[PDB]
């Protein structure tokens, strides 16, 4: 289908001693493939997947230099932001940045992101267009005239519509059996006597990819978001994901209900029922 790439960068200040924690990571759809970690020994960018490994030792060199620049950039940022918000030197603060591109099934550029947060909260992001900014407040309204004077938008447009995309295909083309796969879910359903006369019906979805999936309940042919339980989609460890929705019901009214699944992997929408 459509695909994407994202990079996630986090920096965390350590006031009472040290320089700041810096972690980076990249995802092609829901598969991690690279990572940098300031704290861990090597001080390299490290492959995290098997298909990416093949790239020669100047791929990694370039990536390592670039990643260290980002981390010097976040180093200065944290201190600037203390400046902007007249914050004490003895709190610990947090800068995340996230960016990357989406492509259509034609593999062409579809959209782009670039978003910046301080202490868990949107600070500045670029808008999804011929490029302008959205500043969360007057402190970030400052980084606006700053970034406008530097033509920062135009610099990212060029990367997002340019090398981000040109390079995304290089990873799809090369990681095909890991990245162009779409595993259907292995569905099943369990029953648990919980009360005197009120039971549970969990409906499980095991080992699927990609991670988008819907799991609805229906008492007698309508939606039922109220009275369910739906745990957030989790990853399994082996490249695929897990998920489940359950529902409390009255005893001897089990065949009333139907678990509905939608997924890319499924040509047709599925439906289970407490048959056993």
């Amino acid at each position: 289908g459509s695909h994407s790439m994202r990079y996630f960068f986090t920096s965390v200040s350590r006031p009472g001693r040290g320089e700041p924690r810096f972690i980076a990571v990249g995802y092609v759809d829901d598969t991690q493939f690279v990572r940098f970690d300031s704290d861990a020994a090597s001080q390299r960018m490290e492959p995290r997947a098997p298909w990416i490994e093949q790239e020669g030792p100047e791929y990694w060199d370039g990536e390592t230099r670039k990643v260290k620049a980002h981390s010097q950039t976040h180093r200065v940022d944290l201190g600037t932001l203390r400046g902007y918000y007249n914050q004490s030197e003895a709190g610990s603060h947090t800068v995340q940045r996230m960016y990357g591109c989406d492509v259509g099934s034609d593999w062409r550029f579809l959209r782009g992101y670039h978003q910046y947060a301080y202490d868990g909260k949107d600070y500045i992001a670029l808008k999804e267009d011929l490029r302008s900014w959205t500043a969360a407040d007057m402190a970030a309204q400052t980084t606006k005239h700053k970034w406008e004077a530097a033509h920062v938008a135009e610099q990212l447009r060029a990367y997002l519509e340019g090398t981000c995309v040109e390079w995304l295909r290089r990873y799809l083309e090369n990681g095909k059996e890991t990245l162009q796969r779409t595993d259907a879910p292995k569905t099943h359903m369990t029953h648990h006597a919980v009360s005197d006369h009120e039971a549970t019906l969990r409906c499980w979805a095991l080992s699927f990819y990609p991670a988008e999936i819907t799991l609805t309940w229906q008492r007698d042919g309508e939606d039922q978001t109220q009275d369910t339980e739906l745990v957030e989609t989790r990853p399994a460890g082996d490249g695929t994901f897990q998920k489940w929705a359950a529902v409390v019901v009255p005893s001897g009214q089990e065949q009333r209900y139907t678990c509905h699944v939608q997924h890319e992997g499924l040509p047709k929408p599925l439906t289970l029922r407490w048959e056993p």
Partner: peptide, 10 residues
């Protein structure tokens, strides 16, 4: 491929 451009200080 991470960006050598954009990515400025605030």
């Amino acid at each position: 491929i991470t960006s050598g451009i954009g990515v400025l200080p605030v």
